From Swiss-Prot:
One of its GO terms (molecular function) is chitin binding. This is Chitinase-3-like protein 1. Glycosylated. Residues 1-361 form the GH18 domain. Disulfide bonds join C5-C30, C278-C342. PROSITE patterns: GH18_2. It comes from the Eukaryota. Keywords: Antimicrobial, Apoptosis, Cytoplasm, Disulfide bond, Endoplasmic reticulum, Glycoprotein, Inflammatory response, Lectin, Secreted, Signal. The gene is CHI3L1. It comes from Bos taurus. Glycans are attached at N39, N345. Carbohydrate-binding lectin with a preference for chitin. Has no chitinase activity. May play a role in tissue remodeling and in the capacity of cells to respond to and cope with changes in their environment. Plays a role in T-helper cell type 2 (Th2) inflammatory response and IL-13-induced inflammation, regulating allergen sensitization, inflammatory cell apoptosis, dendritic cell accumulation and M2 macrophage differentiation. Facilitates invasion of pathogenic enteric bacteria into colonic mucosa and lymphoid organs. Its main location: secreted.
């Protein structure tokens, strides 16, 4: 099985114990580690952070201890303008300059491949995405004639039916990609005025109006569109989403006024790291959506949807039962990476739980 784990460059700036450098990563935990995110300047791949050159180097020394570990560099992301990707991909001269700049950059800094995180192509972009993937893969194939191990190409793909239909020719891009990570953890957010879970495994016979907003539907739909099971990797989150309750109601369908309050270390409205949730749970009431098979917790006017060891092991069993290529984790720096917040002296408890399931029959 593959275990694909993202590390995010901005996690280095978090204070005290929340600070996470590539250094903290156990080299034997994941099969592939992806560094997020690279920039595009002058139509060429480039660094984002001031000290990226150093961090690349720290990440790639993990390979001195585990020579089988693979590392990828992810380009794009949320803070990258979708329109900036659109402009690059739709003009042949810009697209060509970009593609040619990638292999030398990856080689200089020690990466084994490139992850595309264009979030998200519009209906006008779908054709250009296909072209970008095709031509990117062709160039990696050509570069490997120089006797080096061929660069890997992956893509992060949204799990909502409408985003898929609008932006992605799954049947075509599947043939050129080494793996596709399905982002099965954005099924709810502050954008609706109610409480709900962003990563449910199943629909659960109760659910109103969205048979499609669950991991099971997204996986079955990708399989139907022509993504081969052995290229499909199911995304499992290591963070939670928080909401401020608008009333004293805390069950399904409850009102909300907005995001939850920022966490001590992540400092971002609406999300919490798992190591912050471990702390939040002291004094919280815990519940579990039995149909959806995911927990949530509530304390005061704060309502948190999250994943724990049981829910993550369940998702891992599901994906094995479906014979998928593996699991993808967003993100190593949001799991309890020091191992000192969540009880047990177990570093990476969520990621480890996934690995345990994937390593059994
Ligand atoms: C990821 O990469 C991206 C892509 O490169 C990085 O984003 C860019 O990087 C640089 C530097 O930070 C900037 O590049 C040049 O910017 C200037 C361009 O000028 C413009 O400013 C005006 C604001 O008034 C703005 O508005 C319009 O244009 C005209 C203005 O007359 C106006 O009539 C219109 O109505 C518009 O309002 C316009 O959009 C431009 O942004 C240059 O001045 C910069 O410095 C050089 O400039 C001169 C030569 O051109 C020299 O005199 C100077 O000495 C110097 O050499 C610079 O070259 C970009 O702004 C920026 N672009 C994008 C796409 O965002 C990004 O930083 C990176 N991310 C990270 C984390 O690194």
């Amino acid at each position: 099985y593959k275990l694909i784990c993202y590390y995010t460059s901005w996690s280095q700036y978090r204070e005290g114990d929340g600070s996470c450098f590539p250094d903290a990563i156990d080299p034997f935990l994941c099969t592939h580690v992806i560094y997020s995110f690279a920039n595009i300047s002058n139509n060429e791949i480039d660094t984002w952070e001031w000290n990226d050159v150093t961090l690349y180097d720290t990440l790639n020394t993990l390979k001195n201890r585990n020579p089988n570990l693979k590392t990828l560099l992810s380009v794009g992301g949320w803070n990258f303008g979708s329109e900036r990707f659109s402009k690059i991909a739709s003009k042949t001269q810009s697209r060509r300059t970009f593609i040619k700049s990638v292999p030398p950059f990856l080689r200089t800094h020690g990466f084994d491949g490139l992850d595309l995180a264009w979030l998200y192509p519009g209906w006008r972009d779908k054709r250009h995405l296909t072209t970008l993937v095709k031509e990117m893969k062709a160039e990696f194939v050509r570069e490997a004639q120089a006797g080096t191990e061929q660069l890997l190409l992956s893509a992060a793909v949204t799990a909502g039916k409408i985003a898929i239909d609008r932006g992605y020719d799954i049947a075509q891009i599947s043939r050129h990609l080494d793996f596709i990570s399905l982002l099965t953890y954005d099924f709810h957010g502050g954008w609706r005025g109610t409480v709900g879970h962003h990563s449910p495994l199943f629909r659960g016979n109760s659910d109103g109006s969205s048979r499609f907003s669950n991991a099971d539907y997204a996986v079955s739909y990708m399989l139907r569109l022509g993504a081969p099971a052995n290229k499909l990797v199911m995304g499992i989150p290591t963070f939670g989403r928080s909401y401020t309750l608008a009333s004293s109601s805390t069950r399904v369908g409850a009102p909300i006024s907005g995001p939850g309050i920022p966490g001590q270390f992540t400092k971002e409205k609406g999300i919490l790291a798992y190591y912050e949730i471990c702390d939040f749970l002291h004094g919280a009431t815990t519940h579990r959506f039995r149909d959806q098979q995911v927990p949530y917790a509530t304390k005061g006017n704060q309502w948190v949807a999250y994943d724990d060891q049981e829910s993550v092991k369940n998702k891992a069993r599901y994906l094995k039962n479906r014979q998928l290529a593996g699991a993808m984790v967003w993100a190593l720096d949001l799991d309890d990476f020091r191992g000192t917040f969540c009880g047990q002296n177990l570093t990476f408890p969520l990621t480890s739980a996934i690995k345990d399931v994937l390593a059994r029959v």
